[PDB]
């Protein structure tokens, strides 16, 4: 996945 940080 890419950057999934909210």
């Amino acid at each position: 996945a890419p950057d999934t940080r909210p």
Partner: single-chain antibody
Amino acid sequence: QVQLQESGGGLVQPGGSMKLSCVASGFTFSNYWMNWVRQSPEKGLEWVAEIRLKSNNYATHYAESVKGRFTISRDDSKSSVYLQMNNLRAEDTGIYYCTGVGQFAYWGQGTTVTVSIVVTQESALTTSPGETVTLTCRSSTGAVTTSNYANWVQEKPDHLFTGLIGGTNNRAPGVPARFSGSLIGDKAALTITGAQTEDEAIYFCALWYSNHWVFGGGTKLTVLG
């Protein structure tokens, strides 16, 4: 608010070098990956490079078009991301943006550099205020799925980019509720439930393919009446 301020663009000869800078404020810069994306009349929006966190050893990845010539780096102590560009070519001409967060919420104003898989969207759609309009985003590899982390980004005049949706269905902070993202059939979709006059703009989708992004060609949305 969040600001991403770019600098460093200008005129450069083929074979030359240039370094772009982007300073971030208003969010915890060091917690997020950062990207460079460029825009040209010819090639549209093109993802150039990403840099991950300190806990990822600052891992990077590049578009094939720039690999071996461009270097992305970051200085978390200065909340800054950079792009070193070497061995410049005519095709590198364009407006360069730093962008990130969930996954393209925030965009800088752009800095202009002058050197001197297909994602398909509707070329245009026409709607009217109060209508429901759905923009779509197709992959040339097969279905768009959650694995493609579709993002939707709005371009308003003066090359003003704002991320609306990320991660398929996630509305970026403070984005109007009339915008929603989903998967419909084998495509990603942006739905505007009650279009507003000010929504007349170009909307780009971006899809993730394991380790890089590909942007669609954009949809020009006209909002008539």
